[PDB]
A paper describes a structure:
Modulation of voltage-gated potassium (Kv) channels by auxiliary subunits is central to the physiological function of channels in the brain and heart. Native [name] tetrameric channels form macromolecular ternary complexes with two auxiliary β-subunits—intracellular Kv channel-interacting proteins (KChIPs) and transmembrane dipeptidyl peptidase-related proteins (DPPs)—to evoke rapidly activating and inactivating A-type currents, which prevent the backpropagation of action potentials. Here we report cryo-electron microscopy structures of the [name].2–[name]–[name] dodecamer complex, the [name].2–[name] and [name].2–[name] octamer complexes, and [name].2 alone. Thus, our data suggest that two distinct modes of modulation contribute in an additive manner to evoke A-type currents from the native [name] macromolecular complex.
Residue numbers in the entry:
A (entry chain G): 36 to 186, 191 to 216
B (entry chain C): 2 to 157, 167 to 219, 224 to 450, 472 to 495
C (entry chain B): 2 to 100
D (entry chain D): 2 to 157, 167 to 218, 224 to 450, 472 to 495
The structure:
């Protein structure tokens, strides 16, 4: 994080935009190392609807490698660059890491329900279609539909391009900014 | 370190001291870009105000944020000058630090803002060169306890029920719960008082022939109320044994136990001079107004706070009583009245004159006796007046502390209501955007994407 | 909050967290502009010296006077700056608050 | 003055006042220059913005640094200005002083910074106007006592235990001796008081108790005390100044009565001295001085407010004299006439000074009661006059005690920080040996020292 060595290399952002990103990063966390609760507040503030504590928690646990307890600027900017202006094939590795909570690269139908309920708690209590108590597990099964029936990272990676919705969703923010 | 990096050439002269004593291969200087300080002064802007300064001063302490190369994000090359958006006059103190090597704190600026601007520039809080450190730390402690008061975080099946009981005012419930208990304690203490008056309950007007011994039943009923309320409090306490050690809990137990132990004594083997002590202990029920009066808690907490000086008071007055009792006793041992029979006797005479009490029960008769008694009175009034002002100052301090704590709790509830109103306003603004200055458009698009990923919408 | 606009693109990356679960028409970003950052250090000279700030830094609270085009009432066209005629030191605290 | 140079040509006109009186060679003006004014608004940029001033405005006090060509040491040639690297707001006050010839000290600034800025610019602290000079002097004295406390004392053989002895919270033996000698003082005074009680040393039962064993308890205790006093005679850094110290005076005063009574009963039976012996036996109470943390505070407080207590003494004596004379003169005609003399009225005036009140001695005439009431009120106000000063000094000294403790803790933390920085520099040098621009030449000089001493540096 010297300001020039982190050019488009290893952080797909120009130095002029890197200056703005670092300035916005430091203005809210001047210490240079973002804590978990700071991330929770800075993520849930843009939504005046239901809480975002758990989803931001998993986001930080993915961000926080080696269990430092707080993320510095280099890993933050690297992950942000990969997530925003990354490679179509390469991006979904960190997506699987987001959906991989049990450390080892395996899914036993339980690392994804909690993520879905955390996401769906965002809608508050004035939602146009009422979130029935079975709707979270219903959409969990809906996501299971595309997941491998036989007993994963490889199947998800090789089936993501089968569904054009995901691929056309990457270009929503891949090109913008 | 490099704090005097402008004195490197002089150190080279120091090397000149030790060539004839040298024995080595002389690996020569390790070379450099330029053997001077031609690095021109750098102009750096802080919120539209430019603070020109020499670069070598900045790399004099690279360990901070301003040193090394982590400052280049804020550099603005297309006009070739560092730009910052911090507070200019605050940063002026850091500039003076870099120029000198020691930091100062102005005593007219918010300590909190000083704190985040301190942490922002990557510098240790205690780099103050002990000239402003004292008031810096005093202000830091003051606002630290201020925010600690801000963080009292009081909350609101039985877990909430016993808290509502603990709540002084729940309209219907708590007012009844506390007023009825206050009435019980008041009637109990007044009954314990009135059982002494002759016409009330004693053979003070029955010798000729009202003295109805039924206030004992009232005492039994009220101690029953006390013990059932104590059981309710125990049910309220999350930690039974730990909250037994509470001050109010010990007051309750020492107020209810005399009744039980006396009734156990009734059928026990009797010992002379033991019932009077329990009848004395009966009056401790007056202490139950701690839950009623906040001032009693204030006074107790003050005494627990200012305790060492009270110990010095008691110790000093003990020296005073001993010295003056001795001098009185040996001053007027042999006289007509001989009132000072012993040093314990002289204790009463001296103690009735440190406090300037004054009886005339027993007075000095020798000239030295009168003189030294007057000296005793003056010394005692000085001693007793010595710690009173610190006591009253501590009491007033704690009183205003709790007063402003309540005020700021009300204020923080008000600002939380304002924050909730702002949240509702943001929700309504998004609703209006959905029905029909570029940040808000991107935010609306993002929340539309959140709706899309959950196939759900929002309705008023 | 409206003052953390510099972290808004990061929330874009948050979509990748729920993107595999996401499925819909995705009406796409609404005609975004200036892909590369063009943050102008706009100058505000208040009865004397000047204070420079980023446009998003002054526009993160449009509800105030300095937001929107209201500030342009005090804009000085012949000098290409904002010559406010207010006290130049309380404005410093206002700038610190805006930041 | 040298700061009113702009009025110098006007004084030229003053010559016309005495010009007809003038008669001489008139060596003429000495090669004057610049007939028309060419005053340059020279710019002085101090770590940022700039301040412009006239050349005569900066040169009207050449005795300072900004006078003469000394300022040109900070002159910046490539920019055509004076880029000083000092604080840019104290320089504002310096400029105002240069313009006025008088310097004002703003209240809300650190004195250390202000004084070092004054020294950097070659000024003197004695030119402050009296409006600001008193405040600057208050700030000087407070920071001066602060820095004095910063370096008062530091903890630094047979004499070594002396430091342990006079700081008993250092070693176990010193602390145990301290506590046990305090216990001995306490047990000796308790022995005295329980000697005075009739059950112990009175003929309570002539038929049969009166223990003379107490006659031993003091002596042993006394001898015990002697040794520590003798200890302070042994490990005495000062042989005579220690005795001059008030502590030693109290110790020897407490020690003497037993020995002087021994000598007296060895030679005489002087009447009225044995009771004096018993009276002076009690000053182990004062010997408690070391154990009582606050007794030293009390003594220093009393010493500090000496003038106030002296004035109290004088005023109370005057009031006692006046009131006693008045009441004796206006009450001598009473039947009982317990006011038999001015000393007889002294006791009444002194018991009515302190709101004490005994009722044994009261006036019986109409004037007597009213004069006694006025006497009581005047005594109340007089005695209450100095107590605020006394308690203010006491609380003050208590505050310097606690703040000195905190400051000592701070100095320990700072020395720990300094040694941590030294260790950091050492390990940085060591890792450089294993493997900024300044550190290159720093380690170059370090390696030159290594060569000149042929002694390699290890971890």
């Amino acid at each position: 994080p010297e300001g020039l060595e982190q050019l488009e290399a290893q952080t797909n952002f120009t130095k002029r935009e890197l200056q703005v990103l670092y300035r916005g990063f430091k203005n809210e966390c001047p210490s240079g190392v973002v804590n978990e609760d700071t991330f929770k507040q800075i993520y849930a503030q843009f939504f005046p609807h239901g809480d975002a504590s758990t989803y931001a928690h998993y986001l930080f646990n993915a961000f926080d490698t080696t269990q430092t307890g707080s993320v510095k600027f280099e890993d933050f900017v690297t992950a942000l660059s990969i997530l925003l202006r990354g490679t179509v094939h390469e991006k979904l590795r960190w997506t699987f890491n987001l959906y991989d909570i049990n450390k080892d690269g395996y899914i036993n139908k339980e690392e994804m329900m909690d993520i879905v309920k955390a996401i769906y708690d965002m809608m508050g209590k004035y939602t146009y279609p009422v979130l029935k108590e079975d709707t979270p597990r219903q959409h969990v099964d809906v996501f299971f539909q595309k997941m491998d029936k036989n007993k994963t990272l490889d199947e998800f990676l090789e089936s993501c391009q089968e569904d054009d919705n995901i691929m056309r969703s990457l270009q929503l923010f891949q090109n913008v900014m | 370190a490099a704090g005097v990096a402008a004195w490197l050439p002089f150190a080279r002269a120091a090397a000149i001291g030790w060539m004839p004593v040298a024995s080595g291969p002389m690996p020569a200087p390790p070379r450099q870009e330029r053997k001077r300080t031609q690095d021109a002064l750098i102009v750096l802007n802080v919120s539209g105000t430019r603070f020109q300064t020499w670069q070598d001063t900045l790399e004099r302490y690279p360990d901070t944020l301003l040193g090394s190369s982590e400052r280049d994000f804020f550099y603005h090359p297309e006009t070739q000058q560092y730009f910052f958006d911090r507070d200019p006059d605050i940063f002026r103190h850091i500039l003076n630090f870099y120029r000198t090597g020691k930091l100062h704190y102005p005593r007219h600026e918010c300590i909190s803002a000083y704190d985040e601007e301190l942490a922002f520039f990557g510098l240790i809080p205690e780099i103050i060169g002990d000239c402003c450190y004292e008031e810096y730390k005093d202000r830091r402690r003051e606002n630290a306890e201020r925010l600690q008061d801000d963080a009292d975080t009081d909350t609101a099946a039985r877990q909430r029920v016993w808290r509502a009981f603990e709540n002084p005012h729940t309209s219907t419930m708590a007012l009844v719960f506390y007023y009825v208990t206050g009435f019980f304690i008041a009637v109990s203490v007044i009954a314990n008082v009135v059982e002494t008056v002759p016409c009330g309950s004693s053979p003070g007007h029955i010798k000729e022939l009202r003295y109805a011994v039924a206030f004992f039943c009232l005492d039994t009923a009220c101690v029953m109320i006390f013990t059932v309320e104590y059981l309710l409090r125990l049910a309220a306490a999350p930690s039974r044994y730990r909250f037994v050690r509470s001050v109010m809990s010990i007051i309750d137990v020492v107020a209810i136990l005399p009744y039980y132990i006396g009734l156990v004594m009734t059928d026990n083997e009797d010992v002379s001079g033991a019932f009077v002590t329990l009848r004395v202990f009966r009056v401790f029920r007056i202490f139950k107004f701690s839950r009623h009066s906040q001032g009693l808690r204030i006074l107790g907490y003050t005494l627990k706070s200012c305790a060492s000086e009270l110990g010095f008071l008691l110790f000093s007055l003990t020296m005073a009583i001993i010295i003056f009792a001795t001098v009185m006793f040996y001053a007027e041992k042999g006289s007509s009245a001989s009132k000072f029979t012993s040093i314990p006797a002289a204790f009463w005479y001296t103690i009735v004159t440190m406090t300037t009490l004054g009886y005339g029960d027993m007075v000095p008769k020798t000239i030295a006796g009168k003189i030294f008694g007057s000296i005793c009175s003056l010394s005692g009034v000085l001693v007793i007046a010595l710690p009173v002002p610190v006591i009253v100052s501590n009491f007033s301090r704690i009183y205003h502390q709790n007063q402003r704590a309540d005020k700021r709790r009300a204020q923080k509830k008000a600002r939380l209501a304002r924050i909730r109103a702002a949240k509702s306003g943001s929700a309504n603004a998004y609703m209006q955007s959905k029905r029909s200055s570029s940040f808000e458009t991107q935010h609306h698009h993002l929340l539309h994407c959140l709706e899309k990923t959950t196939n759900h919408e929002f309705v008023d």
